[PDB]
Amino acid sequence: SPEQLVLTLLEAEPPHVLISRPSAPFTEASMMMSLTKLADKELVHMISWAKKIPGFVELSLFDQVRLLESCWMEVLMMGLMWRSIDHPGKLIFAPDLVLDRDEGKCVEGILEIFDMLLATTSRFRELKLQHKEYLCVKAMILLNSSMYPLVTDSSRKLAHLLNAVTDALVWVIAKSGISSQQQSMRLANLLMLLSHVRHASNKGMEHLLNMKCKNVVPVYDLLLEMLNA
Amino acid sequence: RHKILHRLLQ
Ligand SMILES: C[C@]12CC[C@@H]3c4ccc(O)cc4CC[C@H]3[C@@H]1CC[C@@H]2O
């Protein structure tokens, strides 16, 4: 139910992972080490986060797994964008890892991804995305992935959940008291940005997979696993 | 395959 759902999401927010720039100037290797070390740690916390969304731990194991494998990059990126929303031309990876757009030149293939992330962030900035809208959108990202039938009521349980999240978002948007038509436009504007987030995610995944192959960066543990597919 | 994920979910 919308108010309670929204408070649960609020209380579910994962902590800020702290990381710092290395002492030496960035290289491709050292930049990738920093961002993957950050991602890996944030992944740990994303599991605990997901488990706090009502219903999530009532879905089947394969379902929880499949949603998390499918959305984790998207969720990393969404959280990044929210962190960076007030800081044009910058990506706020962590309080002490604030990358200027140009610093992406450091890593082959990454500037384009920074620009996508930056563009999607500006679009949220233009729309004046509100904290509670961000909470709902991020949970929708967890819940809204293709789930063609696997061969292993969880699917209806999924729909009910994503339904309640979508209602919560509609309810948050109602608080603005704007025109009915403009409440529809805003919903559409926020959900249409979900594709952009999926799209960046796709480029991010591919970029990192390739970095891993070229042994340009070692990846460990959770991140390594989520990567191995 | 989800050696660690399963671990953390359960
Ligand atoms: C996945 C990459 C490393 C981890 C990066 C990260 C790391 C942490 C985070 O909160 C967000 C992102 C989004 C951009 C990601 C990068 C885009 C491609 C690069 O390989």
CSV table of C-alpha atoms and ligand atoms in Angstrom, one decimal:
chain,number,residue,atom,x,y,z
A,1,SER,CA,0.0,0.0,0.0
A,2,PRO,CA,1.6,3.2,-1.3
A,3,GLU,CA,2.7,5.3,1.8
A,4,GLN,CA,4.1,2.2,3.6
A,5,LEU,CA,5.6,0.8,0.4
A,6,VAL,CA,7.4,4.1,-0.1
A,7,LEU,CA,8.7,4.2,3.6
A,8,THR,CA,9.9,0.6,3.2
A,9,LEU,CA,11.9,1.6,0.1
A,10,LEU,CA,13.2,4.7,1.9
A,11,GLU,CA,14.4,2.6,4.8
A,12,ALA,CA,15.8,0.0,2.4
A,13,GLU,CA,18.4,2.4,0.9
A,14,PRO,CA,21.8,0.8,0.9
A,15,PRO,CA,24.7,2.7,2.5
A,16,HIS,CA,27.1,4.9,0.6
A,17,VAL,CA,30.2,2.8,-0.2
A,18,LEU,CA,33.4,4.8,0.4
A,19,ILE,CA,36.3,4.7,-1.9
A,20,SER,CA,39.1,7.2,-2.7
A,21,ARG,CA,41.2,8.1,-5.8
A,22,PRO,CA,44.6,6.2,-5.7
A,23,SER,CA,47.6,8.3,-4.8
A,24,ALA,CA,49.2,8.0,-8.3
A,25,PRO,CA,47.6,9.6,-11.4
A,26,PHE,CA,44.9,7.4,-13.0
A,27,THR,CA,45.7,4.8,-15.6
A,28,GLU,CA,43.2,2.7,-17.5
A,29,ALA,CA,44.1,-0.2,-15.2
A,30,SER,CA,43.9,1.9,-12.0
A,31,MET,CA,40.6,3.6,-12.9
A,32,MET,CA,39.0,0.2,-13.8
A,33,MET,CA,40.3,-1.1,-10.5
A,34,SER,CA,38.6,1.7,-8.6
A,35,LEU,CA,35.3,1.4,-10.3
A,36,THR,CA,35.1,-2.4,-10.2
A,37,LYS,CA,36.2,-2.5,-6.5
A,38,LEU,CA,33.4,0.1,-5.8
A,39,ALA,CA,30.8,-1.9,-7.9
A,40,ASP,CA,31.7,-5.2,-6.2
A,41,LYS,CA,31.2,-3.7,-2.8
A,42,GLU,CA,27.9,-2.0,-3.9
A,43,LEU,CA,26.7,-5.4,-5.2
A,44,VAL,CA,27.0,-6.9,-1.7
A,45,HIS,CA,24.8,-4.2,-0.4
A,46,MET,CA,22.3,-4.4,-3.3
A,47,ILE,CA,21.4,-8.0,-2.3
A,48,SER,CA,20.5,-6.8,1.3
A,49,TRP,CA,18.6,-3.9,-0.3
A,50,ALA,CA,16.5,-6.2,-2.6
A,51,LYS,CA,15.7,-8.5,0.3
A,52,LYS,CA,14.1,-5.6,2.1
A,53,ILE,CA,11.6,-4.9,-0.7
A,54,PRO,CA,8.3,-6.4,0.5
A,55,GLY,CA,7.6,-9.7,-1.3
A,56,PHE,CA,11.1,-10.1,-2.8
A,57,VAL,CA,12.2,-12.9,-0.5
A,58,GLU,CA,8.8,-14.6,-1.0
A,59,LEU,CA,9.6,-15.1,-4.7
A,60,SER,CA,11.4,-18.3,-5.6
A,61,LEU,CA,15.1,-18.5,-5.3
A,62,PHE,CA,15.5,-18.7,-9.1
A,63,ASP,CA,13.3,-15.7,-9.4
A,64,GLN,CA,15.3,-13.5,-6.9
A,65,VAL,CA,18.5,-14.6,-8.6
A,66,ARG,CA,17.2,-13.9,-12.1
A,67,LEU,CA,16.0,-10.4,-11.3
A,68,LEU,CA,19.2,-9.5,-9.6
A,69,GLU,CA,21.4,-10.9,-12.5
A,70,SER,CA,19.3,-9.0,-14.8
A,71,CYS,CA,19.2,-5.6,-13.2
A,72,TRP,CA,22.4,-5.1,-11.1
A,73,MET,CA,24.2,-2.9,-13.6
A,74,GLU,CA,21.1,-0.8,-14.1
A,75,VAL,CA,20.7,-0.4,-10.3
A,76,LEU,CA,24.3,0.6,-9.9
A,77,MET,CA,23.8,3.2,-12.6
A,78,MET,CA,20.5,4.4,-11.3
A,79,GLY,CA,22.1,5.0,-7.8
A,80,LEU,CA,25.0,6.7,-9.5
A,81,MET,CA,22.7,9.1,-11.4
A,82,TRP,CA,20.8,10.0,-8.3
A,83,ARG,CA,24.1,10.7,-6.5
A,84,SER,CA,25.2,12.9,-9.5
A,85,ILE,CA,21.9,14.7,-10.2
A,86,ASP,CA,22.9,18.1,-8.7
A,87,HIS,CA,26.4,18.0,-10.2
A,88,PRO,CA,26.4,18.6,-14.0
A,89,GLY,CA,29.5,17.4,-15.9
A,90,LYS,CA,30.4,15.1,-12.9
A,91,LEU,CA,29.8,11.5,-11.8
A,92,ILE,CA,29.6,11.1,-8.1
A,93,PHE,CA,30.8,7.6,-7.7
A,94,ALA,CA,31.5,8.1,-4.0
A,95,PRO,CA,32.0,11.2,-1.8
A,96,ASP,CA,35.7,10.9,-2.4
A,97,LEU,CA,35.5,9.6,-6.0
A,98,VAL,CA,34.0,12.5,-8.0
A,99,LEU,CA,35.0,12.0,-11.7
A,100,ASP,CA,34.9,14.8,-14.2
A,101,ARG,CA,33.4,13.8,-17.5
A,102,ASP,CA,36.8,14.2,-19.1
A,103,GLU,CA,38.4,11.7,-16.8
A,104,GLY,CA,36.6,9.0,-18.8
A,105,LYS,CA,39.2,9.6,-21.5
A,106,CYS,CA,41.4,7.6,-19.3
A,107,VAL,CA,39.7,4.2,-20.1
A,108,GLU,CA,39.1,3.0,-23.7
A,109,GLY,CA,35.4,2.8,-24.5
A,110,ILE,CA,34.3,4.5,-21.2
A,111,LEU,CA,33.8,8.1,-22.3
A,112,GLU,CA,30.8,7.2,-24.3
A,113,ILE,CA,29.2,5.5,-21.3
A,114,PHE,CA,30.0,8.4,-19.1
A,115,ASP,CA,28.2,10.6,-21.6
A,116,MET,CA,25.1,8.4,-21.6
A,117,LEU,CA,25.1,8.4,-17.8
A,118,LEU,CA,25.6,12.1,-17.8
A,119,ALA,CA,22.8,12.6,-20.4
A,120,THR,CA,20.4,10.5,-18.4
A,121,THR,CA,21.3,12.3,-15.2
A,122,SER,CA,20.6,15.7,-16.9
A,123,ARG,CA,17.2,14.4,-18.0
A,124,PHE,CA,16.4,13.5,-14.4
A,125,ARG,CA,17.7,16.9,-13.4
A,126,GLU,CA,15.5,18.7,-16.0
A,127,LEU,CA,12.5,16.7,-14.8
A,128,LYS,CA,13.4,17.5,-11.2
A,129,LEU,CA,13.3,13.9,-10.1
A,130,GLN,CA,12.2,13.7,-6.4
A,131,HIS,CA,13.7,11.4,-3.9
A,132,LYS,CA,10.5,9.3,-3.5
A,133,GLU,CA,10.2,9.1,-7.3
A,134,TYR,CA,13.8,7.8,-7.4
A,135,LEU,CA,13.0,5.2,-4.8
A,136,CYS,CA,10.0,3.9,-6.8
A,137,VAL,CA,11.9,3.9,-10.1
A,138,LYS,CA,14.9,2.0,-8.7
A,139,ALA,CA,12.6,-0.7,-7.3
A,140,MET,CA,10.8,-0.8,-10.6
A,141,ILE,CA,14.2,-1.5,-12.2
A,142,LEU,CA,14.7,-4.5,-9.9
A,143,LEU,CA,11.2,-5.8,-10.6
A,144,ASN,CA,10.8,-5.0,-14.3
A,145,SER,CA,12.8,-7.4,-16.3
A,146,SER,CA,11.9,-10.0,-19.0
A,147,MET,CA,11.2,-13.2,-17.2
A,148,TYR,CA,10.5,-15.7,-19.8
A,149,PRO,CA,9.5,-19.0,-18.2
A,150,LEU,CA,12.4,-20.9,-16.8
A,151,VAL,CA,12.2,-24.7,-16.3
A,152,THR,CA,13.1,-25.1,-12.6
A,153,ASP,CA,2.8,-18.5,-8.6
A,154,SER,CA,6.1,-16.6,-8.4
A,155,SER,CA,5.3,-14.8,-11.7
A,156,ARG,CA,1.9,-13.6,-10.3
A,157,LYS,CA,3.7,-12.7,-7.1
A,158,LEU,CA,6.2,-10.6,-9.3
A,159,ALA,CA,3.3,-8.9,-11.1
A,160,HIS,CA,1.5,-8.0,-7.8
A,161,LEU,CA,4.8,-6.4,-6.5
A,162,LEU,CA,5.7,-4.4,-9.6
A,163,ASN,CA,2.0,-3.3,-9.7
A,164,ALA,CA,2.2,-2.0,-6.1
A,165,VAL,CA,5.5,-0.3,-7.0
A,166,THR,CA,3.9,1.3,-10.1
A,167,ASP,CA,0.9,2.4,-7.9
A,168,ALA,CA,3.3,3.9,-5.3
A,169,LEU,CA,4.9,5.9,-8.1
A,170,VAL,CA,1.6,7.2,-9.4
A,171,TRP,CA,0.7,8.1,-5.8
A,172,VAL,CA,4.0,10.0,-5.3
A,173,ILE,CA,3.4,11.9,-8.5
A,174,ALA,CA,-0.2,12.8,-7.4
A,175,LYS,CA,1.4,14.8,-4.6
A,176,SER,CA,2.5,17.5,-7.0
A,177,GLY,CA,-1.1,18.5,-7.7
A,178,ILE,CA,-0.3,19.2,-11.3
A,179,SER,CA,-2.9,18.6,-14.1
A,180,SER,CA,-4.1,15.1,-14.7
A,181,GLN,CA,-2.6,15.2,-18.2
A,182,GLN,CA,0.7,16.4,-16.8
A,183,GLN,CA,0.7,13.6,-14.2
A,184,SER,CA,0.5,11.2,-17.2
A,185,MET,CA,3.2,13.0,-19.1
A,186,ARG,CA,5.5,12.9,-16.0
A,187,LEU,CA,4.8,9.1,-15.4
A,188,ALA,CA,5.6,8.6,-19.1
A,189,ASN,CA,8.7,10.7,-19.0
A,190,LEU,CA,10.1,8.8,-15.9
A,191,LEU,CA,9.3,5.3,-17.4
A,192,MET,CA,10.6,6.2,-20.8
A,193,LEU,CA,14.0,6.8,-19.1
A,194,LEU,CA,14.0,3.2,-18.0
A,195,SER,CA,15.0,2.2,-21.5
A,196,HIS,CA,17.9,4.7,-21.4
A,197,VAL,CA,19.0,3.1,-18.1
A,198,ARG,CA,18.7,-0.4,-19.7
A,199,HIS,CA,20.6,0.8,-22.7
A,200,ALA,CA,23.5,2.2,-20.6
A,201,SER,CA,23.5,-1.0,-18.6
A,202,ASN,CA,23.9,-3.0,-21.8
A,203,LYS,CA,27.0,-0.9,-22.8
A,204,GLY,CA,28.4,-1.0,-19.3
A,205,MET,CA,28.1,-4.8,-19.1
A,206,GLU,CA,29.7,-5.3,-22.5
A,207,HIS,CA,32.5,-2.8,-21.7
A,208,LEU,CA,33.3,-4.5,-18.4
A,209,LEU,CA,33.1,-8.0,-20.0
A,210,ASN,CA,35.7,-6.8,-22.5
A,211,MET,CA,37.9,-5.2,-19.9
A,212,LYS,CA,37.9,-8.6,-18.0
A,213,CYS,CA,38.9,-10.5,-21.2
A,214,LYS,CA,41.8,-8.2,-22.0
A,215,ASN,CA,42.9,-8.8,-18.4
A,216,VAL,CA,42.9,-5.0,-18.3
A,217,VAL,CA,41.3,-5.5,-14.8
A,218,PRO,CA,41.0,-8.5,-12.5
A,219,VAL,CA,37.5,-8.9,-11.1
A,220,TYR,CA,36.7,-10.8,-7.9
A,221,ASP,CA,34.1,-12.5,-5.9
A,222,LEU,CA,30.5,-11.3,-6.3
A,223,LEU,CA,31.3,-9.0,-9.2
A,224,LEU,CA,33.3,-11.9,-10.9
A,225,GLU,CA,30.3,-14.2,-10.4
A,226,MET,CA,27.6,-11.8,-11.6
A,227,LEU,CA,29.9,-11.3,-14.6
A,228,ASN,CA,30.5,-15.0,-15.4
A,229,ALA,CA,26.8,-14.9,-16.2
B,1,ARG,CA,27.2,-20.7,-11.0
B,2,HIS,CA,25.4,-18.4,-8.5
B,3,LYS,CA,27.7,-20.0,-5.9
B,4,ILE,CA,27.9,-16.7,-3.9
B,5,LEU,CA,24.6,-15.0,-4.9
B,6,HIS,CA,22.5,-18.1,-3.6
B,7,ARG,CA,24.6,-17.9,-0.5
B,8,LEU,CA,23.7,-14.2,0.2
B,9,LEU,CA,20.0,-14.6,-0.8
B,10,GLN,CA,19.5,-17.5,1.7
C,1,LIG,C1,30.9,-1.3,-15.4
C,1,LIG,C2,31.9,-0.1,-15.3
C,1,LIG,C3,32.7,-0.3,-14.0
C,1,LIG,C4,31.8,0.0,-12.8
C,1,LIG,C5,31.0,1.3,-13.0
C,1,LIG,C6,30.2,1.7,-11.8
C,1,LIG,C7,30.6,1.4,-10.5
C,1,LIG,C8,29.8,1.7,-9.4
C,1,LIG,C9,28.6,2.4,-9.6
C,1,LIG,O1,27.8,2.7,-8.5
C,1,LIG,C10,28.1,2.7,-10.9
C,1,LIG,C11,28.9,2.4,-12.0
C,1,LIG,C12,28.3,2.7,-13.4
C,1,LIG,C13,29.5,2.8,-14.4
C,1,LIG,C14,30.3,1.5,-14.3
C,1,LIG,C15,31.3,1.2,-15.4
C,1,LIG,C16,30.7,1.3,-16.8
C,1,LIG,C17,31.6,0.4,-17.6
C,1,LIG,C18,32.7,-0.1,-16.6
C,1,LIG,O2,33.2,-1.3,-17.1
